[PDB]
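Hey forum,

I'm writing up a methods section and want to include a predicted complex as supplementary material. The small molecule is manganese (III) ion. I've pasted the protein sequence and the SMILES. Can someone with a working setup run it? I'll credit the forum in the acknowledgements.
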Amino acid sequence: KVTLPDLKWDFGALEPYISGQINELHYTKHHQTYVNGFNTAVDQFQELSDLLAKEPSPANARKMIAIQQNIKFHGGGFTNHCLFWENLAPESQGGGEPPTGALAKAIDEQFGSLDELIKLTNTKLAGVQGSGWAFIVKNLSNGGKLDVVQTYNQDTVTGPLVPLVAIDAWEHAYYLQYQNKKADYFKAIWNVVNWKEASRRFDAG
Amino acid sequence: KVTLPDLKWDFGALEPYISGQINELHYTKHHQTYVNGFNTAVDQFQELSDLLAKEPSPANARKMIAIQQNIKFHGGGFTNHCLFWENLAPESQGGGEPPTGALAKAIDEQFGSLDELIKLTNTKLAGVQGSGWAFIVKNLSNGGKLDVVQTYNQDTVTGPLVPLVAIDAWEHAYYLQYQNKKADYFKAIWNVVNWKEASRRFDAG
Amino acid sequence: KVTLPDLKWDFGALEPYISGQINELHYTKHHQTYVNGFNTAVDQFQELSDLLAKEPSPANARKMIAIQQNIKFHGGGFTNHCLFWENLAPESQGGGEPPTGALAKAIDEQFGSLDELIKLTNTKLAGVQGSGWAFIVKNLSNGGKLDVVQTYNQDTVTGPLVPLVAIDAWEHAYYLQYQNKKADYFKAIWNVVNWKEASRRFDAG
Amino acid sequence: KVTLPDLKWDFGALEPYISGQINELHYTKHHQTYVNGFNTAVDQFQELSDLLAKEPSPANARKMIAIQQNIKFHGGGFTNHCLFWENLAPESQGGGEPPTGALAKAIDEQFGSLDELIKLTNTKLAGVQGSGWAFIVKNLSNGGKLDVVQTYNQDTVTGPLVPLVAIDAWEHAYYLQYQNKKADYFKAIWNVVNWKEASRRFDAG
Ligand SMILES: [Mn+3]
Ligand SMILES: [Mn+3]
Ligand SMILES: [Mn+3]
Ligand SMILES: [Mn+3]
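Reply by user p_vandermeer:
Happy to help. Structure tokens for the complex are below, copy them as they are.
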């Protein structure tokens, strides 16, 4: 069912900011595991769905509840990493080039400059006290205003919050290259952020 | 699909410990709402399941994640209240009579007496800092040992933790009769706890 | 130390929207309990602080961690209810009158109208799946933009999120008058919301 | 105030199960950061404590709430790693040798064998969906019974739950040696678990 997104650039294309070693593992092992976990969980839910249709018991309801956590976690892992690769690009393909259009105007109006929004995001990233993510979002419920939000583990942004830029703060995203020095990774990644994709997502809503 | 459990005793059967006013609302309004919410959520998941089979996209995955919370919450609300009514009984039907069999021996071995286990549970109930539950459980993974656990909101005990006695700590469970005096409710409810059902659940596993 | 905020209007001043019965209990019992809980927790932390200065052991650190939850919960309970009473007023004192100044302009720019912001807040309130709050906030980090956020239990808005209007979604806030019909309470409360105070808080930041 | 626990064995003493590279970083960088974070947070709380004594305002309460998270996280990080090093030992110092005394009897009575308890713990470790820990605990409230519990991030076991064996499941605990293969790390670590210390902690309570 759900599959790994097609490889766009080779693993080493984001060097020296993110290593090919990291990208190979992050994609072939970590992302694949969420793919497999999500497929398994949705399958298990379908089986329990049919079981509940036959006997709508509290005991059968309890096993549905047990599987929900795996749908959330692996579903989140699948979606978050898909977003992640799509908002990353080598400098040859426009990575690190500033956003354009309505997103660029919103950034300047709200934060004063790109650098200020980046600074805020880096603060949110360093403030993840465990595994998680930061997302630059467009909030559709308050007039399409920009904000930066943290999530933990593989929690994601849903509903009115549209993800524009996803940044992985899990230790596996940086440890082989940066080790404990996560701030250096958060600083470095903006050199390969695909702001064209972010602008596109701002417009698409 | 999922329906309200058949009424066993009339609403006023647990008086003076829990009022008929409370029981009517708790069953006909609160429990029914979880029933409806659970049916709606499982339906919505089935629709999204079919949508993912057609297009296994990250966008479609995100809406599956959004619905998971409602399955957990309403599923939990459905199951928890089912457990709740089944471990309650009027004194005429054996409510408040101490447990028997293997459960009775386990209680005495682990806690020294029924009163000590009740005291512990009441501490856990008063320690719920918001809406939630306390469960006296049998843990199947550590040799079938008794413990008391808290959950928040409509979170429940799954997997190796077998619920033996569920006690509702949501304010709607007591407010009309006891108001802020939750400790008086926690004290009073043991007069109508169905320990025969608890003993049965200990044995069934 | 921390004390209950001085009574401003009498308990029945918000009728028929919130009953005097509710307000008496909410203030004299619920709010007071958070006051007492917060004083106790900060005292206990001071004692443990001195103990750590004498012996900075992992065992002493563990008891500090245990007390943190009570500081958060009771501290939150104290602050949230203080905010709550201060953004409520009888219609005779301007309750239910629309906001003015920069807040009024921000509301119209972002949400189109007051009614739309209220609708959004009511959705967030009904979406609290347990005990909690909704807050209309000013976000100081994204250009002072308005948003509506949920918290659970006695969690609060800190740092860059400035609370403008706090609405209590705990069942004790409505149950005696509305019972299960929380939507009717969420609808009714806006008739006594102090939008002058909200405008003041928007400006003060 | 709080300091890094004195080094007992050299960084490479747990090889080939945990690398010296990992241990150097885990101790000198990760543990030190929690030490610094905990000292800073307790200092900040003392300053806010004095500020509240002067003005017990809701605004001052809000900043106390903000700092609580850092006390919990860094306090937990400090305590958890202290526990971690103390339940690890080279094979030359008794690492990997089975527990003795009352703990050994409890393990056999509850789980059937050491291998079964290890299997359960490894399941709990692999089930940490993010950063966290597994703890083999003695529960003082249910008759001193053994259990295995998960925590997330730097959350810890407090009160009646006595930590006997702490196992770090944060990716930084294994990534440089095992990368994504966390199950291999969970399997390998038992060769250097200090079960003598675990037996001692079981007895001390
Ligand atoms: Mn990742
Ligand atoms: Mn209930
Ligand atoms: Mn309240
Ligand atoms: Mn660690």
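Some notes you might quote in the supplement: Chain B is about 55% helix and 10% strand. The helical segments of chain B are 20-54, 58-86, 101-111, 114-126, 175-178, 182-188, 195-204.
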